[PDB]
Amino acid sequence: HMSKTLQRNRKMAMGRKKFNMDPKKGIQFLVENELLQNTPEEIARFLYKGEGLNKTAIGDYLGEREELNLAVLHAFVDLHEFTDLNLVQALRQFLWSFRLPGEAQKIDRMMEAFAQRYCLCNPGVFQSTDTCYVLSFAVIMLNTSLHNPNVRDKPGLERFVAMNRGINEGGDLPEELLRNLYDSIRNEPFKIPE
């Protein structure tokens, strides 16, 4: 239906613009105009694809405490494919995905969901999802330490290895795994989406 399709393609683009201004209103427009199905899985797919979507607005929507938004956050994490990625590669991708909001409880929630998904995708690498979470923040801290020129006590490989001793349910992670994470960060800082 040529006319109906052209009108809907234009409304889709209007809904994207409205989302960037106010994510609740944007989603409402798309839903009420039958351009997006009001399900956690469809809204998450929309946000994951992110065509013409402001990443700060994506993150604001994903970090809300409401029922639907929590379910969207879960579904959005489910769309990330972390299989055979090292923790740093997985992180880069997730963090580029949307702009993490500044609130601590939002961060916690989002990184827990990340950690769960990384472990699911890579069974047996970490003994627990707590190991994964802790090492994720180890990696984030390393990114600041190494790459913020104001930090002058920069951890070398040996010290970073030592900082993580006993993390894996009492065991130490393979030295080669920690070195590879270290090298990845040292080589390429995380990119923030602004």
Ligand SMILES: Cc1cc(O)cc(C)c1NS(=O)(=O)c1ccccc1
């Ligand atoms: C704040 C932020 C948000 C992003 O979407 C991506 C990045 C790399 C950052 N900065 S970040 O240093 O990796 C980071 C700091 C604190 C918590 C989580 C991540």
